[PDB]
Design a protein around this ligand. Sequence first.
Ligand SMILES: Cc1ccc(C(=O)Nc2cccc(C(C)(C)C)c2)cc1-c1cc(N2CCOCC2)ncn1
Length: 254
Amino acid sequence: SSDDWEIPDGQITVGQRIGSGSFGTVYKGKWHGDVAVKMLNVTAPTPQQLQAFKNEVGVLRKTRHVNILLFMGYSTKPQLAIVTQWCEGSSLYHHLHIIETKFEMIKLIDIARQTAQGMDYLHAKSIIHRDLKSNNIFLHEDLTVKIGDFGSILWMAPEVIRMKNPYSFQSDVYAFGIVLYELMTGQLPYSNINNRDQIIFMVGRGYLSPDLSKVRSNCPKAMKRLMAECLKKKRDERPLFPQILASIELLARS
Ligand SMILES: Cc1ccc(C(=O)Nc2cccc(C(C)(C)C)c2)cc1-c1cc(N2CCOCC2)ncn1
């Protein structure tokens, strides 16, 4: 009945600082091989820092799926630390918008399917991501999708923009709809608008929505319809991940 999540003291080492996330700094480290370590820089944590650490461990520890970044364990001695697997590769954001990787349609649909697979797993455990975007979709060996929260108005559903509890399974679906747009256009939405306030205001008001005419010629019509359903302005009109997953599986077979 015990998962033995608490890593024994004096075992984790950290090397190169790769970034930051939530409560601390992210490093490439060692613990039974390469690992990523999210660690709080101070030895005396504030009650908020300790609470944020506890919440993150609490959600991560409930996940065991190939499309979810693998949580390996935690430590509180000498510092608060969360350990995950180490993946060679890059985020979907880095591929599409930084190095501009040209994926074949088959691979773009497969990346969509794997993301929907991981999202369906999270929602089944009542876990709302709250920040799904291409940056949080890691391409392990540039093939397998690993969803994480690695550190975002473009992916925000209109009701999340407008604002007490605007987050739901459907606001995650809307963010997935934007990811579908990124895969099918190779672009971020609203690239012809240079004003962030305007984007926030217009999306929240329903005056602005992604330009779906920008999707590639080889994008299946069923994918374009799914994307439109995921992006509905009214949250109750959006499909849930079991239906999204079933639609992607159907269009992939053609
Ligand atoms: C070290 C670490 C700890 C924790 C997390 C994290 O994803 N926490 C998290 C928080 C809220 C909700 C959720 C969900 C998914 C359940 C919705 C997850 C991410 C990292 C991490 C790993 C990393 N790697 C480098 C490349 O190789 C793979 C690992 N690079 C940056 N950061």
